[PDB]
Symmetry: T
Subunit: 156 residues, 12 copies
């Protein structure tokens, strides 16, 4: 059945392309957070195990909301290692860094996602897509909050 | 007691007029969806009965939220058959269509509400009512997501 | 599939027609109650706002149970403004009455549903349909209780 | 301790006999519904696996409610394969029907129990046993609704 | 405001009177079960302390439902020691019986409520007060069930 | 088994006697509150019906707790219309006052229970019984709270 | 679709056959427990009525789990009076035994399931069906624990 | 660690300054609402006690949400009587006014927070901070809705 | 309508006055703890953010309980910045201290409330206002427990 | 950091010593209640297994609250076999008594702990330690109630 | 701190290696299931969207359990696209297959995890790592059960 | 009543001996963890007070499960300081060590329970006591997981 939601097909394709990078970034940050949840050690173990658990649990929900916005725009949601490797601007950590470096990478991850969200608004303006803009706004809120909580641990 | 929320009375009345049409369209969709929930048959009965139940439940809450924004703006919320028939842009189904045609009508219903929501933004531009804009954006989000779920059923 | 529940076709039809009137009254009362829930003002705002909330919430469940009794009997459940306007015995209010007039209208609404339910028992006796008689009994219980709470506000 | 609930011992024995057949039909339908839940296949697996689970779960409670009404009347509740095979009017399915034949057998199961329940209201009439009449009424409402949901799948 | 629930004023007055006696017997049984919950002793303490708890908990709700049916009919609900002793047909226990005698009195108490309930159905036949008839049926069902559970301890 | 809790038989018996007046006042206030819940009318119906419900709900748990302190002290908990009408200092109301008068009686009822609890303290300040002292404290806290909420309605 | 879970058709068939006996014993025990739950009398009514409720509630879940393991192995799950009566090793009880004999039979029921469970293990080692082995293990744990709680009543 | 969220430091300081006045007005209204909750009296006591309780509970969460947006922007959240008295645009009530005047001041208070929220938007246009805009929008929605509920009490 | 709860006006007023001071210390500690919850940083961010959250949540309920005892005694409960500044004995912190100083101040705050509570008892002994006595006793138990948990963090 | 709760070190060390015996009694009773829960047999198995479970569950919480009041006072909490063995006035039971004797020993235990509670109140008076006085008062309330329920089994 | 759990470093490392492949397969099945949840269309949208939701939700918990078992063995858990792609035996789908093909791949994906689980058991036998054995057993049980439900949709 | 679960009395007694040791190690760890929960200090207070709370809460449930496995085997469960101190292989700590030494001891407690569980397995091979093997497996899984979390804190 044809889609008549007030946005033409190529404009929807462009928004979906942006949301696909956002999904890729969000999912890469999900897996990294999950990874650090399992692997962190040192005297901060209990606090960071729990903190990273709260984060990966939140991100798992965010990946589902982003992917379904893509579907609501009429396009397939990417969901493979190859697609996420290709589309993600966040780099993965292949080793087991010290707790402090883990916190530092996650701060940078939050901020990388904010960057990707900001990059999509020029498009939404010209095309007019308030739901997508509200989605990006919610992700920016969560990641900026999460970044304050993470960097606060590094404060002198 | 005089209302001092930063919007003049005739501008509030224009917004309320717009939200009254959105409320009638949402209410008409609610009862149609409820109707189809009762009356659908065929091998998709269990899945459509449940699916339309989720939708009518969500719309029941949406009708209350839209009505209460009208009240927040200092105007009465319409709430009769005659007001909704007059204000709605969606047509009712008096008979019992096939399940496929139920699904198609509900897809068109989602899209009709999105169009009514959009028609209110030019007003909100000129006037400046962020809460109402957030409400329209939420309804657009729900209806565009529901449209994807409904139209997926028809894919061949 | 054939319907073999011990009630014949014309009989089920006549019961369904009675329940359609009850559904139409119940649904009209639901919307009137929803409407007064939004629009009531005055010093009783908070209690009436909340009380009309409990009522429309209960009525929304009752509409689903009446509708689905109609379906168990083998007939489509009506569900449009036109069908309810034709079938319904409750006069609609297009303005915003004072709080005490809203209460009276709702009392009269409760009693209209009861009057419609009572209107169906003569048929049910003849026909024998204990589930529908029990549905009508449950609705009469609710509407009579709700009528006492409403009219109590007017004393 | 003697039982003085306003119904004599042989009248209670007779109500217990009717309830014992109702219990055997309800229990046979419970096990068949449980069987079909486990064994149904095809594209309707997810929807029927779930639907038959709602039904068999509802029926486990019904068996306990019927059986304890028999106890309330002063009589033992039957509860063996042999007892239920003897009292049941519902035929058993020893194989694995296609999904549609499962839906159809279960519609007829619903209508069988309603038949058994209807057969009992004469007696309860004569001896004015209002609890047992309410129990039969609730079982009929359930099975008639279920039969509509089942048969809707075959339309 | 006028009461127009389809039952004239004199008929409601008489049903209200029946229910007032049902309420007094239910409340009296309520306070006796409560009394025995506190006061039972012996090797059955745990079983009966808990069993009598479930019973008074249930009856507390029963008294509220009965009283509000009276209110729905347009009449004040009695609720003093003096009204209940006058209206009650159950006699209270001023002492502290042995466990077995507590059980026997509670059994008898269940059957006394069932009796007061049956006393009422005649007033309902004339006017088809189905809500009240369902209320009585539910109380009869609860007390007949509880009688079985209590009397079972004496076998 | 002998009760060895560091309070002597006569002293316990004197506490039981005081707690028994507390129970009688609490139970009499419970039933008065219940009564007024059912019977209040007027524009404040919703607020008072709900307010009195919360009050009566809380006292029912309190009667159980007062009564079980008496049993902990080795004595029977009173539980009859006669025994409460004797011990209670709450004048019962046999008719249906105006809502404002219901509120006043209920205020006085809170104060009555506190007056009784206070009367029991001399006895406690000669015997060492911290649990009974804490129970009296909890009741006074609740009834003084309740009295403020009640009297506020009258300002 | 072919089944490739690492066990070949014949072995899956042999394991499903043992699980079918386990299902039958478990289901028969379920019904006998359900039966004794309804039918026990005497001083221990309250305690055995609840104890047998807990057990049959657990066994109803167990029948589902065993049946679905049979489906996971690729075979249909038996589910008729005739099929359980043939496969079961538990003797049914058509009467109403005394409370202690009900306990005694339910003890022996637990031990017959264990016996059946143990008979299946030789087969599983051969093919290393670990999920089936864990299933048997959990049922044995539950039945051994229930046995202890039941026989404790007879010490 | 450097803050790289796409907003410069002085731009963040200006947003934080605006949000610090939003926080001060929100906290001042929280406390005023809490105060009126404790202190209101008259026949509306029950409904305003509860309504003001809904409001202060919601505002308590709002104060935490606003303060943590400030922290997300990299600045300290104000949290003293002196800081809030300096930054607040809302005056406190030091006495105990009549219920109507309490309602009037809470209306004025809702509308004061809306004006403060509105005042911050020009900054967010120029700078680009969508999260803060969404926070402002949610506060505006809550206070405008609450203003309707409150002022409806005065119609 | 009169108040006859076995205590006279002049005595209730004296108790209300002492509970007014308790309310003011409890609120000032409430606000201080909330402040530290938002504002604490360092490697202990997570544990202290969470710990101060539990405390400010508890204290919010205590202020409601103290305030309504005053009301039960027949007097208006104070609730303004100025009323609490005047009546309170806790020193407010206008800055953002290091985490260890935040802990130390919150210990002192616990003890300050206890000190205020002890000072009221004499006045209850005369008239046997047992409810107020039990209220004080409960606050003392919470604050002394909270003080132990706080000071255990400083131990070396 | 220094402790300044209005109670000097010597007085706090004396209270700790008392609470340390109360804790060793409470714990010893906790393990003994726990032990009898596992090991009781006979026809009261179900009722006592469940009664002892409720009791030990309660005692496990009480041990934590006693230990942590000892930390609030500024002293370590004992927590080993040797410490509890040294401090406990509760005699341990190394075999498996019969149910009646288990009931007896647990009644003794409730009363032993009440006795230790009482022994500490003089200190608390001297120094005014109201929190610890309320802890003891709560233990005594629970143990005196529990003893009533246990000894009731022996009547 | 040294790891002394009865298994040496080299053996723990070999098991960790095996569990790393189990993690990779399980995470790959996780993401594919998640993908088919978003992307499936056609008449089965509603049932498959929900079924795949239940599956991916269960696998999210499973990956956490397998990861933490590797950590309990003393080794890092892998957690990157490259590491999972290297270790996984499941082939990713880069397109959007038809619903039936999605079902078919999810069946094979269930069977591939079982295949990997089986391959690990020898290394466990030679050292008596019973917790890892039980983890593998639980995964096989979930996956064989899920394969039955999936393949049933294709009959 | 004889015990017939497939294991001889000599064998069941030997298994109950192994589990008595396990029960003793588990209770000893339980109390030590509970002790450290109360007594730990320093900058890790909040994290370790919480972590040790979760651990003792879990071990308290574990002791009940191990005790009741012994009762399922037909032997009494030990439960006194002297029985546990005799059987326990875990050396207690009578002082208050530094937080890090508390962690290290709790690591060794975990591994000591694992050591005792492993000693028991042979005796279960000879006999096929599957429930007991699974209980040990579960305990091993919990302790080896808790060990990783605890030793992680020391990295
Ligand atoms: Mn989803
Ligand atoms: Mn609403
Ligand atoms: Mn429905
Ligand atoms: Mn039952
Ligand atoms: Mn009521
Ligand atoms: Mn009780
Ligand atoms: Mn199932
Ligand atoms: Mn916060
Ligand atoms: Mn409050
Ligand atoms: Mn603790
Ligand atoms: Mn985890
Ligand atoms: Mn246990």
């Amino acid at each position: 059945m044809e889609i008549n939601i007030g946005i033409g097909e190529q404009d929807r394709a462009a928004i979906a392309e942006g949301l696909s990078r956002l999904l890729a970034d969000t999912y890469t940050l999900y897996l990294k957070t999950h990874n650090f949840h399992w692997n962190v050690t040192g005297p901060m173990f209990n606090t960071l195990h729990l903190m990273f658990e709260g984060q990966y649990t939140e991100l798992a929900v965010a990946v589902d909301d982003i992917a379904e916005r893509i579907r609501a725009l009429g396009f397939p949601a990417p969901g493979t290692y190859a697609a996420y490797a290709r589309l993600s601007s966040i780099k993965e950590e292949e080793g087991v860094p010290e707790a402090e470096e883990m916190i530092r990478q996650l701060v940078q991850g939050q901020e990388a996602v904010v960057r990707t969200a900001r990059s999509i608004f020029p498009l939404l303006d010209k095309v007019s897509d308030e739901p997508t803009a509200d989605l990006l706004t919610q992700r920016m809120q969560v990641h900026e909050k999460t970044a304050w909580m993470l960097r606060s641990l590094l404060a002198s």
